[PDB]
Amino acid sequence: PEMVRGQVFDVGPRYTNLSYIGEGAYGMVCSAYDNVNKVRVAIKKISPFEHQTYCQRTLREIKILLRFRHENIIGINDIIRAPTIEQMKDVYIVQDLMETDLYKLLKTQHLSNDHICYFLYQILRGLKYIHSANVLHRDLKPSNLLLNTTCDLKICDFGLARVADPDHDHTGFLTEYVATRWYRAPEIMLNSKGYTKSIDIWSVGCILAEMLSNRPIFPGKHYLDQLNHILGILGSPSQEDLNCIINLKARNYLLSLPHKNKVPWNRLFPNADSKALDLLDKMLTFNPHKRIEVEQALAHPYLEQYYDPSDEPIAEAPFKFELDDLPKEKLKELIFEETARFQPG
Numbered sequence: 001p002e003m004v005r006g007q008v009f010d011v012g013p014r015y016t017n018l019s020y021i022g023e024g025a026y027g028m029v030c031s032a033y034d035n036v037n038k039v040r041v042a043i044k045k046i047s048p049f050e051h052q053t054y055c056q057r058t059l060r061e062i063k064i065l066l067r068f069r070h071e072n073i074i075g076i077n078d079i080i081r082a083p084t085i086e087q088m089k090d091v092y093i094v095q096d097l098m099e100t101d102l103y104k105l106l107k108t109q110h111l112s113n114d115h116i117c118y119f120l121y122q123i124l125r126g127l128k129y130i131h132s133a134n135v136l137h138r139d140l141k142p143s144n145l146l147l148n149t150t151c152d153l154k155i156c157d158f159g160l161a162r163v164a165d166p167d168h169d170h171t172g173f174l175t176e177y178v179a180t181r182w183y184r185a186p187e188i189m190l191n192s193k194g195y196t197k198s199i200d201i202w203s204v205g206c207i208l209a210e211m212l213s214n215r216p217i218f219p220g221k222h223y224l225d226q227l228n229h230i231l232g233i234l235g236s237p238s239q240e241d242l243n244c245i246i247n248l249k250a251r252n253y254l255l256s257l258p259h260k261n262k263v264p265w266n267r268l269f270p271n272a273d274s275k276a277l278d279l280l281d282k283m284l285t286f287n288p289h290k291r292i293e294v295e296q297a298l299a300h301p302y303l304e305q306y307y308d309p310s311d312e313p314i315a316e317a318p319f320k321f322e323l324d325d326l327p328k329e330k331l332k333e334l335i336f337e338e339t340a341r342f343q344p345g
C-alpha cells in the first residue's frame, strides 16, 4: 500500500501515483491516477468512526452528493472502503480533481471584474440546484469553492448541510453555532438556527465582497465580535427590521448600541462595478426576509451576460433524510450501507 505524509492510503489497484493536496481534522485529500478512466482524480481519505460528529458530517455529505448531479457541485465518482464493517477503519471518496480553490486564489491573485462576475454566476448556479433540493449548504466560504485551470467552479464540503426547516428556525440570543464565523449571517447571533435558505445567501454576499478586495469583509475575532463587524458596515438596523426580532435579549442588545450609519459600498469598494455593489447590497441585507433569493440573484443585471434560467437546472425532487441522536457505531453502519453500491461484489 502507498503511503503519503506518514499515513496509509490504501486505494489500489485502481488508483496509483498519489500526491498530497490538503487535509482536515478527520480526513486527508490526495491526487491519484484512475487506471479505469485514465484520468487523475481527487481522493479524500476520512477516518471518522472515533467521533459521532465526524460520522454525522461524513454521512450527510455522502447521501447528498450521491443524489446530486450538477456542473457547479463536486461529485462522488467512487467510494473505497474495506469489504466488512469490522475491517472498515477509513473511507475514501473519489471526487473531481481541481487545481485550486478561491481561498488560495484570493491570497495572491487580483480578480478581474469578468472573473468576479463568472465566479459569482457559477456559485449561484450551483446554489440554485442545492436550494431547489430543499438543502442548505451552511458553510459557504472561499475554501469550499474549488476551481480548475479554466475557471470552472465547483461547490464542495456538504458536511454541515441540512434540509431547510424555516418553521423551526427561531432560537435565543447568542445560541451556539458550528459554521465558519466570518461568513455567518447576523441573525445567527440574534435569533436563528440557520435552517433557512437566506443563511447561504449571506455567505455568498460575504464571498462576493471578498472577491472585490481580496480581504474578508467581516473578520470577527470571536462570536459576538462578528455581529459588531456586520453592524459596523450596515449601520444600525431600522425600526422595521428590529420589530421583526421578537426575542427581547436580541432586540435589547441591538437597542443598547449607539447609532451607527451605513458605510457606502462604493467607499469600501471604490473600483467595483456599480451593478456588483447593487447585488452585494441585496445579498448583505440585515433582514433575512428582505434578503435576495438565489433565483433573483441570478436574474440581477450584474449577471446578465450569463443568466439563462433554462440552463440553470434544478434537482429532480426535494431531499429528505434524522442523524442528531444516532451513536458513532450506528452511523458507521449507515456509512457502510450508503457506500455498498461502489463495491466490486
Ligand SMILES: O=C(NCc1ccc2c(c1)CCO2)c1cc(-c2[nH]ncc2-c2cccc(Cl)c2)c[nH]1
Pocket: 021, 022, 023, 024, 025, 026, 027, 028, 029, 042, 044, 046, 074, 095, 096, 097, 098, 099, 100, 101, 146, 156, 157, 159
Ligand atoms: O471534500 C473536500 N473538501 C473538504 C474537506 C477536506 C478534507 C476533510 C474534510 C472536508 C473533513 C475531514 O477532512 C474536497 C476537496 C477536493 C479537492 N479536489 N481537488 C482539490 C481539492 C482540494 C483543494 C484544497 C484542499 C483540499 Cl483538502 C482539497 C475534493 N474534495
